């Protein structure tokens, strides 16, 4: 069962502020959302110092870039500690009501979309660049399921029956037909050195 | 009962490092524990949003910044969700062994000790400018610890006896004879204008 739940007004705010705002610097949703990714990691390295079989689900710590020409769709995915149906639901697991308000308080008082991060609703970034956005995720103490949303105010949840992750987050992005530069390995070679060489797990730009 | 730990290994050399290096902007030190506090602030609000009890221990979310001539200290406030006696053990909720060695690996590689907090370990920049640090801190699962290092590769926890605080973390920094500019109202007005401007939490740095 496919369930479609409504944004907070804030977070349908935040959105609209994303798509609708003219703003050129758009290769920045690359470097939150691989931001995400390894503060994900960290947790769930840190759960592992103390509980090794938090890794019973999968040992490899790592950040994989997938684009696809034929889909039109890239893929950012990480082997980190994944969401709870109840942390998707919650905002991607972000305090987003709090942060979207800071935020629009600090552009107004002279900051740009890029200073999103800073805010801890990076993930939203993802809306520079495409028009729908694909969550899939597996939490230790959950099972695998996919958000989706191409805005409009509401996000769906379902269950992820297909190709069993074990442990992390995908986020796929279905580009926008005007953003396709981020398909093409040369600009996300460029975008990763620029913006995330201080990464503490190695991220594999797969090939097409 | 006091109990002694060694650090392990590679946070004694991030610790001498730290300590040994010649590196003139110590200044850095405030944003990084600005910024754990921030952070802590932002996991407890997030864990109240679907259990409004986590804020029994009180609803107030702010950092406080306390200088004291006499004492000569600088003492970081925060109402954040704190941390076990687990947490403080292991290296106060870092993952402080993988993070050690990318900062390590960054600082050949052609970058300072100002870019501590991009590896997670931002709060060992403490001993830029304390010869001594203590760490006060409840969390809503644990009682009032004390954990406290003077570097030379041990630190001690104990249980908190006096003042207690509800929930959150209190950073004591013991101050170097040659650093007591941190403790001026004018220079800690600077630095947290310079940055930590934009932190989603009321900072109050109080009047002696
Ligand atoms: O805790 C987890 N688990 N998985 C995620 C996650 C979220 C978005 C994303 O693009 C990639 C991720 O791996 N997060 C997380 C990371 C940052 C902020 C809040 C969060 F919930
Ligand atoms: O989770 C919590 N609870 N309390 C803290 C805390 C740690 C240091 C600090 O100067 C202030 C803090 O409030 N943290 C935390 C923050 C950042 C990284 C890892 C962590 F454990």
């Known amino acids: 069962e496919v369930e479609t739940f409504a944004f907070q007004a804030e977070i349908a705010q935040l959105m609209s502020l994303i798509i609708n705002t003219f703003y050129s610097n758009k290769e920045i949703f690359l470097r939150e959302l691989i931001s995400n990714s390894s503060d994900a990691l960290d947790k769930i390295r840190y759960e592992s110092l103390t509980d090794p079989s938090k890794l019973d689900s999968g040992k490899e710590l790592h950040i994989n870039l997938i684009p696809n020409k034929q889909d039109r769709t890239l893929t950012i995915v990480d082997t980190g500690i994944g969401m709870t149906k109840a942390d998707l639901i919650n905002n991607l697991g972000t305090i987003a009501k709090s942060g979207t308000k800071a935020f629009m308080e600090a552009l107004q008082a002279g900051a740009d979309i890029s200073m999103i991060g800073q805010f801890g609703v990076g993930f939203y970034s993802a809306y520079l660049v495409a028009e729908k956005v694909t969550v899939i995720t597996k939490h230790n103490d ?60 190695p991220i594999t730009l797969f090939v097409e």
Not at 153 to 171: A, I, Q, Y
């Open 142 to 201: 959950d099972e695998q399921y996919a958000w989706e949303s191409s805005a409009g105010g509401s996000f769906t949840v379902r269950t992820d029956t297909g190709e069993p992750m074990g442990r992390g987050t995908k986020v796929i992005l279905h580009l926008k037909e005007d953003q396709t530069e981020y398909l093409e390995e040369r600009r996300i070679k460029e975008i990763v050195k620029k913006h995330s060489q201080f990464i503490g797990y």
